[PDB]
Amino acid sequence: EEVETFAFQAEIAQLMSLIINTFYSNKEIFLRELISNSSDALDKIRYESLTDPSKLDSGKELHINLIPNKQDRTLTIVDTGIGMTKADLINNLGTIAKSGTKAFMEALQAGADISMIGQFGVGFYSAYLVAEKVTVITKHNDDEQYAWESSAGGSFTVRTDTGEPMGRGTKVILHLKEDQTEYLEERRIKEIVKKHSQFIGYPITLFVEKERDKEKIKEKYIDQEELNKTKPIWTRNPDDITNEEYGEFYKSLTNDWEDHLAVKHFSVEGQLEFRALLFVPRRAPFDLFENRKKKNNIKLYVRRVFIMDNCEELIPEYLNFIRGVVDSEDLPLNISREMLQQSKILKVIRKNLVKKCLELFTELAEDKENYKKFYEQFSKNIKLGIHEDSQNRKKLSELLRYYTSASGDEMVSLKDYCTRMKENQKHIYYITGETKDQVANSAFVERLRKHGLEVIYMIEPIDEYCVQQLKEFEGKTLVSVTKEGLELPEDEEEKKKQEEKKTKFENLCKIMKDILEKKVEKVVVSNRLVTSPCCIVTSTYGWTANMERIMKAQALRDNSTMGYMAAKKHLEINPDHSIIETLRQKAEADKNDKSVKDLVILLYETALLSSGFSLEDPQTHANRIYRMIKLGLGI
Amino acid sequence: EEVETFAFQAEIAQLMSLIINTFYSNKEIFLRELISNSSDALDKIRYESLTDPSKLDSGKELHINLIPNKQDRTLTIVDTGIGMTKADLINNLGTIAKSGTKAFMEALQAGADISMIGQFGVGFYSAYLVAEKVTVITKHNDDEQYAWESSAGGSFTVRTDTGEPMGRGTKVILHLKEDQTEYLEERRIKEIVKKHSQFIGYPITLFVEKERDKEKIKEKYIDQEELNKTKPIWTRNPDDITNEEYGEFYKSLTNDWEDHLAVKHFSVEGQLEFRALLFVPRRAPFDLFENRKKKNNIKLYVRRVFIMDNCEELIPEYLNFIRGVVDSEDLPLNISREMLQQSKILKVIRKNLVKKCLELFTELAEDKENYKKFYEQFSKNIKLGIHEDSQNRKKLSELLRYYTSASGDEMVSLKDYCTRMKENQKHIYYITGETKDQVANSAFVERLRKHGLEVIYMIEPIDEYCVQQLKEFEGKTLVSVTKEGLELPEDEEEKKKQEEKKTKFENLCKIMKDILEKKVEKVVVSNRLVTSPCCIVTSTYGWTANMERIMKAQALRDNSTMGYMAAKKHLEINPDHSIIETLRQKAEADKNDKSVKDLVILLYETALLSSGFSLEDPQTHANRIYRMIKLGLGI
Amino acid sequence: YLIGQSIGKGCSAAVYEATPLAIKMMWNISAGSSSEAILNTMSQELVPASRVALAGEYGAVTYRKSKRGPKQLAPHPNIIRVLRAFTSSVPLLPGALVDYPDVLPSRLHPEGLGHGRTLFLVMKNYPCTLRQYLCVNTPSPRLAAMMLLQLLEGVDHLVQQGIAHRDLKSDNILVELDPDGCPWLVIADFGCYSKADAWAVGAIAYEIFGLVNPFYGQGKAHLESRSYQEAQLPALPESVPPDVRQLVRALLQREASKRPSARVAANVLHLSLWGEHILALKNLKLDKMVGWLLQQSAATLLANRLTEKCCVETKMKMLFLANLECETLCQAALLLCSWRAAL
Numbered sequence A, B: 001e002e003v004e005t006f007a008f009q010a011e012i013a014q015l016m017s018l019i020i021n022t023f024y025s026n027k028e029i030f031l032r033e034l035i036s037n038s039s040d041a042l043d044k045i046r047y048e049s050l051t052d053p054s055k056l057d058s059g060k061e062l063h064i065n066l067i068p069n070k071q072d073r074t075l076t077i078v079d080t081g082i083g084m085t086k087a088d089l090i091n092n093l094g095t096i097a098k099s100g101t102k103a104f105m106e107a108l109q110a111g112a113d114i115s116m117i118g119q120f121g122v123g124f125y126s127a128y129l130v131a132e133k134v135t136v137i138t139k140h141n142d143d144e145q146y147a148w149e150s151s152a153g154g155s156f157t158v159r160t161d162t163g164e165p166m167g168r169g170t171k172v173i174l175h176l177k178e179d180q181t182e183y184l185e186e187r188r189i190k191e192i193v194k195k196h197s198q199f200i201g202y203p204i205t206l207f208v209e210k211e212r213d214k215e216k217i218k219e220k221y222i223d224q225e226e227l228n229k230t231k232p233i234w235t236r237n238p239d240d241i242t243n244e245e246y247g248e249f250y251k252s253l254t255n256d257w258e259d260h261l262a263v264k265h266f267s268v269e270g271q272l273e274f275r276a277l278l279f280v281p282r283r284a285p286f287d288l289f290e291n292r293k294k295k296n297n298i299k300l301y302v303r304r305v306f307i308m309d310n311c312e313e314l315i316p317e318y319l320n321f322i323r324g325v326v327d328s329e330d331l332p333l334n335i336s337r338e339m340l341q342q343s344k345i346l347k348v349i350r351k352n353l354v355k356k357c358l359e360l361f362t363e364l365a366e367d368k369e370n371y372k373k374f375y376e377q378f379s380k381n382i383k384l385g386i387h388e389d390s391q392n393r394k395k396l397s398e399l400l401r402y403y404t405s406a407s408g409d410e411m412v413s414l415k416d417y418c419t420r421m422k423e424n425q426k427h428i429y430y431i432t433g434e435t436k437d438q439v440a441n442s443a444f445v446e447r448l449r450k451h452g453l454e455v456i457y458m459i460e461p462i463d464e465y466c467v468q469q470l471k472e473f474e475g476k477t478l479v480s481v482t483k484e485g486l487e488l489p490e491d492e493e494e495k496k497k498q499e500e501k502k503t504k505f506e507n508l509c510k511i512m513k514d515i516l517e518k519k520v521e522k523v524v525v526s527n528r529l530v531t532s533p534c535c536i537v538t539s540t541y542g543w544t545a546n547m548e549r550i551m552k553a554q555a556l557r558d559n560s561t562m563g564y565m566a567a568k569k570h571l572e573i574n575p576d577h578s579i580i581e582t583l584r585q586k587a588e589a590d591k592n593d594k595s596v597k598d599l600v601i602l603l604y605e606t607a608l609l610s611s612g613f614s615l616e617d618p619q620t621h622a623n624r625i626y627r628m629i630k631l632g633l634g635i
Numbered sequence C: 001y002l003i004g005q006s007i008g009k010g011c012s013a014a015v016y017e018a019t020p021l022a023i024k025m026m027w028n029i030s031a032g033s034s035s036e037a038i039l040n041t042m043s044q045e046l047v048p049a050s051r052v053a054l055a056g057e058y059g060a061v062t063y064r065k066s067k068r069g070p071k072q073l074a075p076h077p078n079i080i081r082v083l084r085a086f087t088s089s090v091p092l093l094p095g096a097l098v099d100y101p102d103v104l105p106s107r108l109h110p111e112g113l114g115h116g117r118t119l120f121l122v123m124k125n126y127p128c129t130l131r132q133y134l135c136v137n138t139p140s141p142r143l144a145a146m147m148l149l150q151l152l153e154g155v156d157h158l159v160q161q162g163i164a165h166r167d168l169k170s171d172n173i174l175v176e177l178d179p180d181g182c183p184w185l186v187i188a189d190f191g192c193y194s195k196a197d198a199w200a201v202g203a204i205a206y207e208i209f210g211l212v213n214p215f216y217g218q219g220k221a222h223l224e225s226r227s228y229q230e231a232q233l234p235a236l237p238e239s240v241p242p243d244v245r246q247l248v249r250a251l252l253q254r255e256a257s258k259r260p261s262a263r264v265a266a267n268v269l270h271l272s273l274w275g276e277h278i279l280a281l282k283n284l285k286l287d288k289m290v291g292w293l294l295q296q297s298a299a300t301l302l303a304n305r306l307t308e309k310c311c312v313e314t315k316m317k318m319l320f321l322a323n324l325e326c327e328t329l330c331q332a333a334l335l336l337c338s339w340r341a342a343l
């Protein structure tokens, strides 16, 4: 019945303690917060100078100066921003969770061009993380020079300062603690202001005092040097940035002695707004696929300040060589400003990035030489992507280049193969091995090369992973020439010759099958062998020779599967070779002759060797060869 | 001069907005906060019952009940905790950043046994993430049943409730939003309360209403089922937990049909205090080294609530098979209670964990049978560690087991080798290959096995990585038998025979060196070959045969290095073989006889094959063999 | 058929004990999207089941679900238990009937279809120490100065951590000798003060060029605090470029104030090797700026254009061309030709 309404208030002490201790991960953040607030004040005073320039008569230039002083453990951040009045001082720096920047922005007109950093209202108090007492001296038009001072004790003192006239500006004076006196030197300051807040629209000038005084020989009396040297070009509109400026931006962003290779600069204007800049390096990093704990070199910026890096869901893994930045104007941001609220947004960014960089690759493929350099250096990443993702695979396939029998010396794409395919040909014959030369002279390709068809040379271990999932390309199916059921478009008298050769050698294959027992699962007359006695081939389903070799040699392999996934061999003989005919004479003459037995054993050994398989115990084969040699020499 | 001191106050609206939106990553956290606060109240009322039990006459049992109601979109969390009074209600739920739990704990005596969850003061307001209006009905001794209602509008209402008597307890009633009505069903509730807040010292009972009413055939009229079934045993003191209870805890923690293998339960009592529980599974996970994005199965708990998982710096990568929990009583915690403040603490935890689990492995090695299973299933991880870390390598080495020439069929450790080493032997001879049988009959080990020395069989690809950094063990150095400069402790007449064989075959090696040109860098008389004509061996510095084969077959390899790091072969001949003697006769007779040229070419081919190298173009060797066969048969 | 007691196992099957043989019942609920996995279990179990052993009528059991049930061959590594060959389904089939998707009857799931690109590992061959590698072969001065620059970067990175690697000789150093890939050098102390380690690395540098170091031969190889009694410098062969001769001349000098620290020597080597021979580098004519630093980096690649076979050179260029400061670079570009001019 009786309802006593109230309104929340807060316990200040524990609130300040929470803000200081429990918000930010690493104490180095404080510099970013102060710098961003100072830049906010800078653009504040800049905006108002448009209407009237007289308000800029106090101070013309707009800059930020850092003056670390080791004698007094004071790190001073002085700027020429708008400043504060007394009442503004009290209301902004006293009232927690109130931000004068947000109030000024919302009070501004609708169509304005300012983009201020923060609106939360608590970023300043982070300074305490590395200071005991903070002193803020600021002089702003319509008011005199006032002095702020607080020790985070729940109290602050505001006193009219009588120091030197600062003009329209604001300087913050921190008194660091001995535990944090490291930030006084210049190395960590440089590293921080380059990591965060590097792309700030105003010059940041360090003011170290490294005067030698070694007696004219004195050097570096006072050192003024800029840090935010490179402007953020992605903010600028494209079609005006020539292909040059991208070069310097690349060299500065990532230390490199050479230009980039290609650049994609685009932007999205939906309810999720962001601009992006993507570089593809000219040199593949040596430690790239080496796991450096650095998954993506893409840096995420929000209003030109650093947010997060190496958050893998930004870009898929195989596109890690891409280096560049992505800047959004507004996003849900965790209080510490180091991660997003709902990671669902990252998925949309990922999709946009992958489609845009795939378009970039497609456009790059229009040039031959540039592409050749790119492929030659990053082909592994494309095949990795083909192996991993299953929705751009169709668009990823065209990019691949390959060596063919009719290619010569230069690589060629699958579309060229499809164009050069004959009318009756309905497949794409590929052969995987370990080197181009050995594959080119292999036994399987003889009949094909004789007939005139083309074949594909895949000579790197990364291939198998790609092809085993790339089972089709543009209506035409990929078939491996080292599979059991291989067929070619022939005539009918070819079939008659084949069946008559079967009816001639149907006993010899059984005879050789009882020998070699449990070493090969079947032995049949071949149709792909010319100028070679016999070759072995794996079954239609299961690992091929090179695949089994690869994943047997693969480290961190699971032994049980290696025993599980073993290929089932099938021996094939050439009914035209003189060796086979003479062996058939000897077999049909003497059902069992030892000479035949050892001969077919040795033949199978050599065939297993040439077929790409690795012999089980090479010592026995070597001993057989040595016995043959000793017999030949008369020993 | 004039100093106007003040004291910070806060703008409530934006502060509440920040607390609601910008603190927690995923909205599902709210359940953990309410559950933890309710458990805090539960242990609060428990503590006071010790002094006087009459204060427990209101309600005996201590439990937490969740009653989701889909009809009204209300998720009720009712318990029998201490409750609040009116003034306590106002001061705690109204004043942001104030926590009555911390006040009660600090007001308590020094040596007390309570361990309450939170002290910050803002966890409750997180409920808003998934509710528009929150209603808290609570009845606590010394006061009547009151009700709090707030919509996060900067106002809260407190009215004396006239509902049913609840006794000493507290129930929270949320009114979810249509976007978040998913939390009403039981699946997500179960998953959440099992992920977080699973190890709470009080029974949590869901109250779903899945009554079928299908007409006696009705089932599940009202379902009361517990969720926190398993108690946290790591809190209990060891030497009392038998080896059984660890079994059920393992099965419950991780769904498994079989017991664990071994358990290590220890605790640290320094300024950094935490207890730990470590399990080593009986079965190696099939997808273990497969990158599951799950780097460490170690779960981190703070006061029996979940904090973080898969944060790799907890435990090194190679010790990922270890499954277990680590609980600390107090740690610097980010406001969202999902990460630590200074990650330096994780390093100390990592060092303690690794030293403790290494001690565990050492103690496990005392039992041969158990070790055999463990090593057979997790040997790869030990070698990975040996390859990666460089400070426990000395202690990780002892764990390794190996097949030796004199071992027989069972593996053996390096200490056994060192004990069985002869007096003059000063090295440890190991031979790496691809299978035990082929290695055992290789050409290199013949002279060694004849002399009586022992040799080590390394027959997995992961070996090379380990041995190439394990260059020494207990004063004795590891030497590979397939290296160029191999020497054995012999007598002096052996040296005389060797030098006379050199002075006999010094021309033949040059003759064979001008042939085979640029295929082998040197050909010398051997000292390790018996009952084999010739074997090839790699140089002292560079890759060995098996190493080069392995990292040639390794996917994601860098081609430039494969061209860079190629082995330099050296052919070695056996001056005792009849083939070599007859070849020397033929060479010294005819400087250049082709019979000799083709013969030595074929000999080198067979030696390259047996030595473990992969032939470059096996077609030429096969054609040579076919020519030999055709010559033998008379074709 | 009688069966035993009821237990739950795996959350995908029941377990009784029939009259003894174990009836591992299979309960499939086709109302959820996990029943597809459960029909996969239906297929993967009964691997040795006979082809004509089914006992379920077609009017009660759908032929389309059981036609390829009988398995010709399958490894089935995961689950061990098994049931007899039969299936039961209500005549008017249970609620949420199987959709009968008629999917891929003749197709066989290739056992072991699931494969994985396992984690990639690196190999660093450490076959020899520095003394042996320089006793077997001695490389040309280009990569020799490269190795000296590697050693100088290492010894700078060490002492800047606080500890002083006073003992530094030919044996403590290890060389990751790639077979034909150029040898990468690493610092270590497997064999058990400012600028003293620089003196040691200068002596070792004199050694690397194939000449015996007299501070190693006669003595005083521990540290120069025991001042050698030569009071001169040994003459490195003239084949070496006078730049590194001046470097090793100033580094192991007597005076401890004149000895350039490791950073200035490292980046003066950076200037000499990579930054091409330009009149800006000499006569201290380059006015030091970070812009001129990036211009020197732009001059750095021309050391790849001719020296690219050396993987070590591109490696060092990727590793150390980023870490170099304006002050030490100014001091380097000053000293390098305030000696060379000798004005």
Ligand SMILES: Nc1ncnc2c1ncn2[C@@H]1O[C@H](COP(=O)(O)OP(=O)(O)O)[C@@H](O)[C@H]1O
Residues within 6 Å of the ligand: A036, A037, A038, A040, A041, A079, A081, A082, A083, A084, A092, A093, A098, A099, A100, A101, A102, A117, A118, A119, A120, A121, A122, A123, A124, A125, A170
């Ligand atoms: N250098 C400065 N000059 C003028 N005003 C400042 C300066 N630094 C901070 N302020 C004011 O202090 C208020 C509180 O800062 P804070 O809220 O912590 O940062 P932000 O406003 O970026 O969230 C801001 O509204 C801002 O107007």
Ligand SMILES: Nc1ncnc2c1ncn2[C@@H]1O[C@H](COP(=O)(O)OP(=O)(O)O)[C@@H](O)[C@H]1O
Residues within 6 Å of the ligand: B036, B037, B038, B040, B041, B079, B081, B082, B083, B084, B092, B093, B098, B099, B100, B101, B102, B117, B118, B119, B120, B121, B122, B123, B124, B125, B170
């Ligand atoms: N179920 C409950 N019974 C009694 N008191 C409670 C209950 N839930 C919350 N409170 C009180 O509300 C206060 C504010 O909660 P909050 O600070 O958000 O959680 P915590 O105290 O765990 O940080 C706490 O001090 C606690 O005493």
